[PDB]
Amino acid sequence: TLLGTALRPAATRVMLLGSGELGKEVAIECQRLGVEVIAVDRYADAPAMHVAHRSHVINMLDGDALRRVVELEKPHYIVPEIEAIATDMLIQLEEEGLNVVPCARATKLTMNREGIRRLAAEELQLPTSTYRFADSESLFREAVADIGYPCIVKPVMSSSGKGQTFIRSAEQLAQAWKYAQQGGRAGRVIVEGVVKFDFEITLLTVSAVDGVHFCAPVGHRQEDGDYRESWQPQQMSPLALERAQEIARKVVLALGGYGLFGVELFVCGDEVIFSEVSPRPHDTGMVTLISQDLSEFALHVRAFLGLPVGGIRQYGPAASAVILPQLTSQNVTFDNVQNAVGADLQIRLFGKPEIDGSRRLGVALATAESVVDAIERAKHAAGQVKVQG
Amino acid sequence: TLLGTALRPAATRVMLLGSGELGKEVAIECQRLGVEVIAVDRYADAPAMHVAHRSHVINMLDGDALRRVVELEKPHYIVPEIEAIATDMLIQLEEEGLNVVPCARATKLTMNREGIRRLAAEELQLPTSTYRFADSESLFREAVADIGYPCIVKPVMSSSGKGQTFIRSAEQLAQAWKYAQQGGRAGRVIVEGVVKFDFEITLLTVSAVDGVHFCAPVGHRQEDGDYRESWQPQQMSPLALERAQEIARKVVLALGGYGLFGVELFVCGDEVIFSEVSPRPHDTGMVTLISQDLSEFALHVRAFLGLPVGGIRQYGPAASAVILPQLTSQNVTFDNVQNAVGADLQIRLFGKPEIDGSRRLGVALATAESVVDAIERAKHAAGQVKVQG
Numbered sequence: 001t002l003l004g005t006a007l008r009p010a011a012t013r014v015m016l017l018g019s020g021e022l023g024k025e026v027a028i029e030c031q032r033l034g035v036e037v038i039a040v041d042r043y044a045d046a047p048a049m050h051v052a053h054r055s056h057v058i059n060m061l062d063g064d065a066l067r068r069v070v071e072l073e074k075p076h077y078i079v080p081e082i083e084a085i086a087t088d089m090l091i092q093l094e095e096e097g098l099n100v101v102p103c104a105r106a107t108k109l110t111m112n113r114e115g116i117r118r119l120a121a122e123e124l125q126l127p128t129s130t131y132r133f134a135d136s137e138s139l140f141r142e143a144v145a146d147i148g149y150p151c152i153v154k155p156v157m158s159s160s161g162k163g164q165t166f167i168r169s170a171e172q173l174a175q176a177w178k179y180a181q182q183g184g185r186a187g188r189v190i191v192e193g194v195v196k197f198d199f200e201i202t203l204l205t206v207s208a209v210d211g212v213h214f215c216a217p218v219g220h221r222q223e224d225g226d227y228r229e230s231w232q233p234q235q236m237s238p239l240a241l242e243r244a245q246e247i248a249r250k251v252v253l254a255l256g257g258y259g260l261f262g263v264e265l266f267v268c269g270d271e272v273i274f275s276e277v278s279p280r281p282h283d284t285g286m287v288t289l290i291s292q293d294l295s296e297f298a299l300h301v302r303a304f305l306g307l308p309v310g311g312i313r314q315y316g317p318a319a320s321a322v323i324l325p326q327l328t329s330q331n332v333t334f335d336n337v338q339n340a341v342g343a344d345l346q347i348r349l350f351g352k353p354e355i356d357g358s359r360r361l362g363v364a365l366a367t368a369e370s371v372v373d374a375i376e377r378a379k380h381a382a383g384q385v386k387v388q389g
Numbered sequence: 390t391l392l393g394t395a396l397r398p399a400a401t402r403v404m405l406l407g408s409g410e411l412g413k414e415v416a417i418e419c420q421r422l423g424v425e426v427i428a429v430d431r432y433a434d435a436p437a438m439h440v441a442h443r444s445h446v447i448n449m450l451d452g453d454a455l456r457r458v459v460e461l462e463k464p465h466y467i468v469p470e471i472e473a474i475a476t477d478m479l480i481q482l483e484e485e486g487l488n489v490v491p492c493a494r495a496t497k498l499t500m501n502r503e504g505i506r507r508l509a510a511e512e513l514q515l516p517t518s519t520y521r522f523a524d525s526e527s528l529f530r531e532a533v534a535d536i537g538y539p540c541i542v543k544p545v546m547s548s549s550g551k552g553q554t555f556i557r558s559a560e561q562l563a564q565a566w567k568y569a570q571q572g573g574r575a576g577r578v579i580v581e582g583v584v585k586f587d588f589e590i591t592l593l594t595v596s597a598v599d600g601v602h603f604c605a606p607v608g609h610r611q612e613d614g615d616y617r618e619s620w621q622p623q624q625m626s627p628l629a630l631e632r633a634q635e636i637a638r639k640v641v642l643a644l645g646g647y648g649l650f651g652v653e654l655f656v657c658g659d660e661v662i663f664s665e666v667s668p669r670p671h672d673t674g675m676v677t678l679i680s681q682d683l684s685e686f687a688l689h690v691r692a693f694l695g696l697p698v699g700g701i702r703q704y705g706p707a708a709s710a711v712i713l714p715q716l717t718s719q720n721v722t723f724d725n726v727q728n729a730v731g732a733d734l735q736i737r738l739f740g741k742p743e744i745d746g747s748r749r750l751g752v753a754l755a756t757a758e759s760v761v762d763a764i765e766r767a768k769h770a771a772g773q774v775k776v777q778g
């Protein structure tokens with residue numbers, strides 16, 4: 001592994017496709033290695049752009065635009081932060097010699113539930129929820145019938161729960177089907193049975209030159225399509241853990257390429273069920289900013305740059321809790337910060353330029369003697385911040 | 390404590406006066422809190438500028454230049470990274486209402502050995518080496534005669550051991566004096582008696598809204614004006630730690646304002662002697678980038694923003710080892726990186742645009758079960774890096 005000096009002729013260049021808070025930490029980790037960072041997004045002053053050498057605002061869904069910026073910048077690495085990109089163009093660029101992290105195929109299978117679902121369930125022969133795909137309401141109706149209640153319906157092109165519906169009753173069908181055609185692209189869906197699990201975890205799995213290494217399991221609480229709190233390590237049976245790792249390894253190896261992956265699983269006793277996987281750092285993993293020697297962002301960079309991980313140290317019970325206010329403003333200020341920091345307690349404020357509704361503006365990070373106390377410490381701190389408009 | 394959003398009208402603005410690798414970390418920590426950063430230095434593309442919202446290049450010693458930039462950017466805080474700055478203007482500006490970190494007086498006192506030495510030794514009555522100042526070759530000779538051999542002569546305005554001579558005999562008098570005239574303002578020198586200590590430490594002390602806090606003692610190895618390796622914690626007797634803390638507390642308070650200070654001390658069994666102090670993060674403190682929950686940079690930022698520290702977590706034995714090559718290039722590259730990182734092993738590459746001789750271009754960091762093992766690991770890693778240019 002040879003690294004140049006950022007801004008110099010031999011500089012090593014990383015292009016970030018998506019400049020949110022996750023991308024912001026990757027940018028930081030690149031900067032720490034004197035790696036040149038070019039932050040791209042669909043709006044100005046995105047968080048990662050604050051810490052990049054330079055940036056561009058483009059429609060990442062537009063492959064011609066993608067090609068143009070890439071060609072312009074000639075990056076050594078293309079690192080997507082989100083699903084919403086012209087992956088077809090990534091495939092092309094990769095085919096043309098670009099290094100897409102972790103690999104372009106990985107980004108495509110994952111942006112489509114069908115792709116990934118089939119791979120895991122069928123190909124990989126892995127445990128997942130019951131499901132069915134449908135191209136028409138009739139089929140939709142048909143499928144919901146085959147799956148039963150309650151059930152979940154999601155566009156094969158959905159995230160943050162966008163265009164999805166929890167179904168317990170036939171009465172929702174008109175709206176459900178409509179919600180589904182609504183989000184994502186705006187027309188195919190998936191109908192999954194509902195899993196009754198003890199808890200959900202994110203198994204942050206890094207695939208690098210020295211193989212696959214795992215972070216301790218991250219548990220989390222989802223609400224209204226948003227994670228609220230995350231903690232580590234989530235208590236699980238040795239057997240359960242063992243099964244989760246097997247699943248994670250099979251999946252990452254199957255997707256291919258080096259990087260950090262967020263493997264979403266469900267746990268019921270010693271039983272583990274595959275849900276889905278992010279081919280990049282996961283929001284829940286923000287707890288690793290205080291819980292490990294190497295954060296999920298640092299692991300991602302280490303891996304993609306072709307460097308060995310060796311090991312991951314975990315510093316005891318830890319937690320993250322989001323700062324998710326809801327208002328409309330283009331000049332947000334944060335008060336009472338002094339009551340959100342202290343021993344074993346930190347906060348991050350993203351730099352987002354504006355808000356117009358519910359948006360993640362920061363996160364609180366805490367460690368404690370117990371996971372339960374870590375959670376409370378983090379929640380309480382997030383709650384002390386007064387978000388003004 | 391109220392923080393705005395970087396780039397927004399209510400943004401909290403921090404101006405860095407000196408954009409080296411230490412300032413780089415300060416910038417990253419500011420950015421983590423959505424603080425707006427303006428990086429200033431005497432050359433372009435300086436490390437901190439890589440992660441700042443905006444950058445300027447001026448003569449920081451020029452008081453008028455300083456006022457101009459300050460007027461132009463209107464920062465809430467001015468954070469100097471070096472001694473060589475227009476201290477008189479900082480005083481002016483602080484009066485005109487600007488928050489100079491930690492305070493303007495602290496900067497004035499420490500820009501030259503005379504202010505700080507006389508304050509510590511005469512005003513505060515802290516134990517220090519014997520010393521005499523001299524502004525002429527002849528006064529220089531009279532000083533040596535009084536101080537005795539061996540002694541160390543140093544220019545009053547210097548750093549990183551520039552223009553210093555360890556004088557063992559009169560043979561060296563002529564050269565010593567010449568070499569001393571070479572370093573600084575290019576005049577006045579300090580002649581100090583030689584302290585025979587068991588070891589030296591850097592006691593990273595934080596003066597904050599909630600009091601004075603101390604990081605575990607940092608030991609270090611100096612070689613030709615430059616620290617080479619640093620480690621933490623450095624073992625010391627209880628009595629020595631307490632005397633070191635009393636000294637550090639006294640000095641920071643006397644200097645005034647909130648921030649992290651690097652108190653340089655010589656330890657002689659249970660006795661502690663004051664050497665000097667950086668009214669800001671110290672290079673030897675880079676070990677904290679791996680050894681604590683909050684690095685010395687995160688701590689400085691937390692303190693100067695008026696937030697409480699609460700407490701500092703130390704993760705066990707750790708060390709830092711510099712990457713200090715020698716060459717002339719404007720396009721430095723680093724190879725063999727895959728052999729300089731791994732389990733409990735990291736590196737940082739500063740992004741310095743060029744080198745023309747010996748310059749610290751990065752640092753290796755490691756943790757282990759003992760400071761001895763950490764030091765070895767970190768030195769080995771620094772060594773694995775193939776610097777070419």
Ligand SMILES: Nc1ncnc2c1ncn2[C@@H]1O[C@H](COP(=O)(O)OP(=O)(O)CP(=O)(O)O)[C@@H](O)[C@H]1O
Pocket residue numbers: 129152158159160161162192193194195196200222264275276
């Ligand atoms: N079959 C299933 N059974 C039980 N809960 C399910 C489920 N599918 C989804 N969930 C719940 O809903 C959450 C979000 O589901 P999903 O991961 O499919 O959404 P998403 O793809 O739209 C968002 P993201 O990509 O950001 O994770 C899960 O983390 C889980 O809490």
Ligand SMILES: Nc1ncnc2c1ncn2[C@@H]1O[C@H](COP(=O)(O)OP(=O)(O)CP(=O)(O)O)[C@@H](O)[C@H]1O
Pocket residue numbers: 518541547548549550551581582583584585589611614653664665
């Ligand atoms: N009186 C004294 N007796 C014994 N050793 C001394 C000494 N003064 C300095 N030293 C040794 O020399 C080193 C550098 O001295 P000093 O810190 O004063 O130089 P400096 O101010 O130019 C460097 P910097 O500001 O970068 O730390 C010390 O860290 C110590 O090893």
Ligand SMILES: [Cl-]
Pocket residue numbers: 520521522
């Ligand atoms: Cl004197």
Ligand SMILES: [Mg+2]
Pocket residue numbers: 158159160276
């Ligand atoms: Mg998903």
Ligand SMILES: [Mg+2]
Pocket residue numbers: 264276
């Ligand atoms: Mg999900």
Ligand SMILES: [Mg+2]
Pocket residue numbers: 547548549665
């Ligand atoms: Mg000094």
Ligand SMILES: [Mg+2]
Pocket residue numbers: 653665
């Ligand atoms: Mg010194």
Ligand code: NA
Pocket residue numbers: 099100101102103104257258
């Ligand atoms: Na790849």
Ligand code: NA
Pocket residue numbers: 049050051052053054438439440441442443
């Ligand atoms: Na910038």
Ligand code: NA
Pocket residue numbers: 483487488489490491492493646
């Ligand atoms: Na001030």
